[PDB]
């Protein structure tokens, strides 16, 4: 009872939202390299037996919509759920190609009561984005 | 080189 049941027919989905290009009216430098990360993830998760679904350059609305729909799917036969977000961001905020969106709004779709098929199942959210503008100068060892 |  110490380990999550991972012997379901399917390991689960693996949504990867890859954002590289942003609207000129936002002030975001194209995230060069995120293509390598997206591809690296895909292969890594495919080995872990996940149904990987990649998505590129999404807007606020599109992001929220993709998540809303995925949360409305039937995960009954799945053992978990992973979501990878690669983009610009601030504290508790993921950036869509056109505008920002709270990470909370996204995660709330997968809560125990808004998605019964995932209740009691691990919901992993890997986030590659900024959380502010502080620089860690580090210290020698 | 760059940041997010």
């Amino acid at each position: 009872d110490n380990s999550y049941k991972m012997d379901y027919p399917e390991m689960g989905l693996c949504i990867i939202i890859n954002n590289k290009n942003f609207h000129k009216s936002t002030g975001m430098t194209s995230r060069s390299g995120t293509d390598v990360d997206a591809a690296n993830l895909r292969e890594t998760f495919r080995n872990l037996k996940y149904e990987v679904r990649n998505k590129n350059d999404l807007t606020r609305e599109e992001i929220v919509e993709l998540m809303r729909d995925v949360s409305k799917e039937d995960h009954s036969k799945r053992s978990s759920f992973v979501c990878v977000l690669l983009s610009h961001g601030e504290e508790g905020i993921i950036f869509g190609t056109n505008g920002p969106v709270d990470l909370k709004k996204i995660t709330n779709f997968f809560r125990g009561d808004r998605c019964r098929s995932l209740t009691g199942k691990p919901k992993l959210f890997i986030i590659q984005a900024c959380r502010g503008t502080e620089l860690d100068c580090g210290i020698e060892t | 080189w760059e940041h997010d």
Binding site: D37, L48, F110, F125, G138 | W1
Partner: protein, 92 residues
Amino acid sequence: HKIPVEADFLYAYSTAPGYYSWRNSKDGSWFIQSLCAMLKQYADKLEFMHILTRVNRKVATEFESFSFDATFHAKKQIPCIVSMLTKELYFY
């Protein structure tokens, strides 16, 4: 007999709160590239939390920024694991 609606969630941030997250032009973000490498090497013998701890050490120790602008030069990064899980996670 019920559970919190916020339980069983696990967030793997690439950096600490209030901090920047670094990315390489050709290799890809430090976080993702370390995360994938650790998964490829330990996802068959280590629990997820233990794997992410490895990811933290790799990112904190083997990476340092480089820039012609002093302001962004020689900077470090530490990933932030935020777990509301209630059991151990194994990918197998």
